[PDB]
Amino acid sequence: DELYRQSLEIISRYLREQATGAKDTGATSRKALETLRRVGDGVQRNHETAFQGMLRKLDIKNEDDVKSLSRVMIHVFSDGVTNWGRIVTLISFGAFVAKHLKTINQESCIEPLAESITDVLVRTKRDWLVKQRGWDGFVEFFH
Ligand SMILES: O=C(O)c1cc(SCCc2ccccc2)ccc1NS(=O)(=O)N1CCN(c2ccccc2)CC1
Ligand SMILES: O=C(O)c1cc(SCCc2ccccc2)ccc1NS(=O)(=O)N1CCN(c2ccccc2)CC1
């Protein structure tokens, strides 16, 4: 799936940049990162309170914590209205969790976190993402 692999590249790179501050390792994939850096950073500033609250409540300190959350996150994310704000909040929350993982570690484990965020996104929103012209539709929505 091109939608799954494209989503994994964009979500993994943003979470890696956010956790470190660089970061260290098809124009739409590139233009989606620049939009996500701009809108994603804004969501992390405007909703830090709710992000700190969810993070404290979920705890999330290891890969086993990352795995069990995804199984709950798939179910609750498939419920209710879908829009780009909701999708960027999911990714923004992923970046917020990743910054916390680097804070209590040395780096990892943010790669299984990015896979779990992508799996939540593509498994629950694939039809809507298709109807919205995928990651290209994302760039236009926040031009
Ligand atoms: O999004 C934020 O970060 C958020 C922050 C505050 S804190 C008071 C802010 C305020 C503003 C102006 C003047 C006085 C107080 C209050 C609401 C905020 N969001 S939500 O958009 O209204 N929202 C989303 C987060 N919600 C949540 C639900 C369950 C578990 C944890 C969080 C609560 C509902
Ligand atoms: O998009 C929604 O459907 C959405 C709904 C709520 S209501 C859950 C409040 C809560 C309470 C305790 C601990 C964590 C979260 C809050 C945030 C929402 N989105 S998100 O910010 O994009 N996000 C992150 C939190 N997610 C989560 C839900 C249940 C267990 C574990 C994680 C849902 C996806």
What tokens were used for 24? 């260290």
CA angle 119, 127, 73 (to 5 degrees): 35
Of 60, 61, 79, the closest CA to residue 69 belongs to 60
- Resolution to 1 decimal place, in Å: 2.5
User: CA 111 to CA 77: how far, in whole Å?
Assistant: 20
Nearest-CA residue for ligand 2 atom 4 is 77
Which of 43, 47, 52, 54 to mutate to test ligand 2, by most ligand atoms within 8 A of the CB atom?
Answer: 54
The enclosing H or E element of 92 equals helix 84-103
**Which top CATH class is 1-142?**
mainly alpha
Q: Which ligand is nearest to the CA of 48?
A: 1
Residue 121 makes CB contacts below 8 A (sequence gap 6+) with 7, 11, 77, 87, 90, 91, 129
Residue 45: CB atoms within 10 Å: 10
Q: Which amino acid is at 136?
A: D
For the chain, counts of helices (H) and of strands (E): 7, 0
What tokens were used for 30? 């590139």
Supply the DSSP symbol for 21: S
User: CA 13 to CA 19: how far, in whole Å?
Assistant: 10
Does residue 109 have a cis bond before it (omega within 30 degrees)? yes
51 Cα nearest atom in ligand 1: 3
Q: What SS3 class is residue 134?
A: helix
| Ligand 1 centroid to residue 1 C-alpha, Å | 36
Q: For the chain, which residues make up each domain, given as ranges?
A: 1-142
Experimental method: X-ray
54 Cα nearest atom in ligand 1: 31
In order of 61, 76, 122, the CA distances from 40 in angstroms are 22, 21, 18
Nearest-CA residue for ligand 2 atom 24 is 90
Residue in the block written with tokens 């909703």: 47
Supply the DSSP symbol for 102: H
